[PDB]
Amino acid sequence: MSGENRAVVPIESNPEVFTNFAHKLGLKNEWAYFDIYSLTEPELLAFLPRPVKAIVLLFPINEDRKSSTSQQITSSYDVIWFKQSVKNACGLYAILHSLSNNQSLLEPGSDLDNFLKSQSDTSSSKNRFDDVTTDQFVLNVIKENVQTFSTGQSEAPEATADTNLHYITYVEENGGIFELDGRNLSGPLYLGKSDPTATDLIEQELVRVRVASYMENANEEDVLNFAMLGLGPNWE
């Protein structure tokens, strides 16, 4: 048995490392990742040639986080979820929830395309992390990154950064906007219906006030490692 989970995971590496693993996951060439400076100054979305297809936040779990209220949400909703079992998958599961939550940009025969089909061929629904074959797609592709091909950063110093970053990615569907926080064993956590002025996904004031809620629960040391990222059409 080869080595595993001794690797480090991607922090402050938003541009390069995300386009590498996502392309091996099956992401078409017409789409890629690209970093985000701001989302509340309208001067940034004034420089956008095409609408971004998804967004994700990079912010750590502070010890307060009283904005959370654990309750049993619906499990038959129009969208999907997975459990963060393996901890070293902080780079994997972040890109997984960006890709699977928009099945429309996948390529027929890719790893994600056959991962959706293999769960409907087994005791899972289509997304439920509860069967052995659902975990096989996770443990074999991460094996290519715990080897000497060190994802995130070189020399694999620790399991994570000097802090405990978290990864929450989602999109708007059926006229509303929600989130995918894989820390919740209960399921997803809705924000409310989408704005009538949402320019593409950046101007969504609902998710912007939720980022502003986490930084009030955090100290000045915990907001230090804060960045944002997205997945829109490629620009090359």
Domain boundaries, the chain: 1-236
Q: Please state, in angstroms and as integers, the Cα–Cα distance from residue 145 to each residue in 27, 89, 156, following that order.
A: 18, 10, 11
Does residue 161 contact residue 225 with C-beta atoms inside 8 Å? yes
3-state class (DSSP) for residue 176: strand
Residue 58 pairs in a beta bridge with: 167, 227
Does residue 101 contact residue 56 with C-beta atoms inside 8 Å? no
Q: Give residues after which the chain gaps, C-N over 2.5 angstroms.
A: none
Cα(126)–Cα(234) distance, integer angstroms = 29
Residue 54 pairs in a beta bridge with: 231
Does residue 217 contact residue 211 with C-beta atoms inside 8 Å? no
Name the helix (H) or strand (E) containing 231: strand 227-233
Cα(190)–Cα(211) distance, integer angstroms = 14
Q: Please state, in angstroms and as integers, the Cα–Cα distance from residue 31 to each residue in 23, 43, 56, 57, 130, following that order.
A: 9, 23, 15, 19, 31
Cα(196)–Cα(205) distance, integer angstroms = 10
Main-chain phi, psi angles of 65, to 5 degrees? 50, 35
Sequence-distant (6+) residues with CB within 8 A of 124 are 130, 131, 133, 134
Q: Which two tokens stand for residue 179?
A: 């989130």
Beta strands in 70-207 (DSSP E): 165-170, 172-173, 176-177, 192-193
Sequence-distant (6+) residues with CB within 8 A of 168 are 56, 57, 59, 179, 180, 181
Q: Which two tokens stand for residue 211?
A: 């980022």
H-type helices in 26-159, by residue range? Answer: 42-45, 92-100, 111-120, 132-141, 143-146
b/e code 38-55 from CB counts within 10 Å (16+ = b): ebeeeeebeeeeeebbbb
The identity of residue 178, as a single letter, is F
How many CB atoms are located within 10 Å of the residue 24 CB?
13
Residues labelled catalytic: 90, 166
Does residue 157 contact residue 165 with C-beta atoms inside 8 Å? no
Does residue 183 contact residue 89 with C-beta atoms inside 8 Å? no
Sequence-distant (6+) residues with CB within 8 A of 219 are 62
Cα(145)–Cα(90) distance, integer angstroms = 12
Could you tell me how far CA 7 lies from the centroid of its own chain? 19
Q: What is the DSSP string of 17-64?
A: HHHHHHHHHT--TTEEEEEES-SSSHHHHTS-SS--SEEEEEEE--S-
Does residue 80 contact residue 196 with C-beta atoms inside 8 Å? no
Does residue 44 contact residue 208 with C-beta atoms inside 8 Å? no
